[PDB]
């Protein structure tokens, strides 16, 4: 089971602060350490600092600019950092990680999706694609489903509640005024479509939402 | 049993104790401080072991005015722990000699 | 602080054949290196510890080799799956340091 | 009290003045020569204590002749220290055991 | 004797904007380094010791980082009054060394 639990994205306005959080489960010892990590789009991992929830001390990055400070909550074994005055150099994904005191990162979070705006909040609108009536099908069909208008990243896209995993891509949102757009594409065999049923799953953590649209013939 | 045996009992076990506890509280005091090396657990109780003993080869040593002061404490129930061992084998000895001639 | 270098930034490799990423540190730290694989929009995942340690779970095409200032991560027949970026990470001297990664192409 | 006492008492807090009388005067040894490294006094303190416990890391060491001097000082306080308590605490056991018998 | 390396000489910045120094050591150090800062027609003033530790009545906006030969001094929002010579100094090893400076320019 996973050992670590991230809130999915957290939005906050330039100057405002906010407390991200790790759950931990699974083994754990007096001895562990709770490692906290940057990530920018398109860039490395970036160790911030740790803490050790046995007696509460925490060291940090001196290299860069202090923005975290860490705690740690003893009887909901959750460890968290607190991030101030942000700016949208302060945007990304950051994980936590528990080290058991010799050296490397065991395992990892799913990491939680900072992002640094003034615009507001926004769930997606999910439509399906649908190939047209004059489109001639192999042994195999494409089929997927639109994701526009949301805000902020991310947004998790399954097929079939995660069953169907292979022949699907997603595509990397696109930002155009404010709202963020990806479509997800899906194929399976010409025969099995629509007689087995084909349904995208789409959460947008931010918003708290999870939507289906199930994909059918157009008329 | 005798009072001798006891104490060097006594003093290995509470050198034991202060190994692992010396180990877990070096980590403690050198993470935070730049170019530390004393700062995994497994290593320390290497470490440890070698400052009580008096070996002190150098590939381990805490640079933070805490890690040092664990250390000295560590060094101190070394030398203290062995010397009790000593003085209770020179009281073993006596003893048997005392006996020897009656 | 450790400097870890990973050079070159890409790697592009035909399927099946060898490949060995490079992490140089800045200073000796023994063989304190530890390897992440982290796929698109995947977290880091632990592939290789103190060097040359296997992680259970990760493929036995996945080895390390290296001490002192020079450590090598090595893929014996690549496939698709392993298209990611890789991370060398030392935990000789504190604080702890992340190299800055290598992308595998196929 | 009994002499092994006090004599491990005043040993104890002469060894604690040695420690700082040769911290303060390794320094005032050391500066002046190229490449030393034991000049600043709080880890001569550290320096003097790894010194007169005999661990000797190599961490910190001296390079001119009166500070080596002032550092052979060190070495045998410390060891004469330990070794007087040692004997302190074998001439308490022996007492005891005697007690033991009559 | 340690040769402390201060380049570049001269550094441009725009206002508010963070900036860095550097401070290389000829040999390692430790954290040994101390930083001053040097107005003009002013005496020289502490600004950080052993490399990171705060001095009373230093802004905020200055920190350093480092150990071993590379150090940094590094200031968060500039304004003009962090106009001035920066030098880097140790005191690892007799005899006490400073490095060239670097002046800050606005
Ligand atoms: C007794 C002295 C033996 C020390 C061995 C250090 C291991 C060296 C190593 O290269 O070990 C190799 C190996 C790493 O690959 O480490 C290991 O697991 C070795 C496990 C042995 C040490 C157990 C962990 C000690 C934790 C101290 C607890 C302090 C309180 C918390
Ligand atoms: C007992 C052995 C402890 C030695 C600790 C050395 C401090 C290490 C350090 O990294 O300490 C850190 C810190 C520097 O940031 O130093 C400090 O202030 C630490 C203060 C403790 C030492 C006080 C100063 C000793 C002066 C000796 C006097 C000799 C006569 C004159
Ligand atoms: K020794
Ligand atoms: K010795
Ligand atoms: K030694
Ligand atoms: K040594
Ligand atoms: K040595
Ligand atoms: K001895």
């Known amino acids: 089971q996973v050992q670590l639990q991230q809130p999915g994205a957290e939005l906050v306005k330039p100057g405002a602060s906010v407390k991200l959080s790790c759950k931990a489960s699974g083994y754990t010892f007096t001895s562990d350490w709770i490692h ?25 990055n001196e290299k860069i600019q202090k923005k975290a400070t860490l705690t740690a909550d003893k009887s909901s074994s959750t460890a968290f ?17 528990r080290e058991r005191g010799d050296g490397y990162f065991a395992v990892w979070g799913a990491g939680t999706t900072v992002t640094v705006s003034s615009a507001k909040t926004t769930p997606p609108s999910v439509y399906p694609l649908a190939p047209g009536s ?18 902020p990243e991310p947004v998790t896209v399954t097929w079939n509640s995660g069953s169907l995993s292979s022949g699907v891509h997603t595509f990397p949102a696109v930002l155009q005024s404010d709202l963020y757009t990806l479509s997800s594409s899906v194929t399976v065999p ?19 939402t999870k939507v289906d649209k199930k994909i059918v013939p157009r008329d | 049993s005798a009072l001798h045996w006891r104490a ?24 935070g401080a730049p170019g530390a090396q004393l700062i995994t657990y497994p290593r320390a109780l290497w470490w440890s072991v070698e400052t009580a003993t008096t ?31 000593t003085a209770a084998l020179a009281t073993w000895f006596v003893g048997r000699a005392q006996e020897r001639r009656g | 602080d450790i400097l870890l270098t990973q050079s070159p930034a890409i790697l592009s490799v035909s399927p099946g054949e060898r490949v060995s990423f490079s992490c140089r540190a800045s200073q000796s730290i023994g063989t304190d290196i530890h390897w992440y694989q982290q796929r ?30 020079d450590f090598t991560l090595s ?20 604080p702890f340091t992340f190299g800055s990664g290598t992308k595998l192409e196929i």
């Open chain 1, 190 to 208: 010409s025969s099995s479509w629509p007689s087995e049923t084909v349904t995208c799953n789409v959460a947008h953590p931010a918003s708290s």
């Open chain 2, 8 to 31: 060097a009992g006594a003093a290995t076990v509470l050198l034991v104790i202060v190994l692992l506890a010396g180990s877990y509280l070096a980590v403690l005091a050198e993470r």
């Open chain 3, 40 to 69: 698109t929009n995947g977290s880091p995942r632990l592939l290789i510890k103190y060097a040359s340690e296997s992680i259970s779970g990760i493929p036995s095409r996945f080895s390390g080799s290296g001490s002192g200032t």
């Open chain 2, 55 to 85: 070996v002190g080869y150098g590939d381990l040593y805490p640079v933070t005015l805490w890690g040092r002061l664990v250390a000295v404490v560590v060094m101190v129930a070394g030398i203290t722990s062995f010397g009790l061992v």
């Open chain 1, 134 to 151: 004059a489109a001639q099908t192999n042994s195999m069909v494409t089929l997927g489903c639109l994701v526009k208008g949301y805000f």
């Open chain 1, 81 to 97: 950092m607190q991030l101030s005055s942000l700016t949208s150099e302060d945007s990304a994904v950051y994980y936590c990680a």
């Open chain 3, 75 to 94: 893929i014996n027949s690549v496939e698709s799956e392993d298209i990611a970026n890789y991370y060398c990470q030392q935990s000789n001297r504190w």
């Open chain 1, 36 to 60: 906290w990590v940057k990530q920018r789009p398109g860039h490395g991992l970036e160790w911030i600092g740790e803490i050790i929830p046995s007696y509460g001390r925490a060291n940090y």
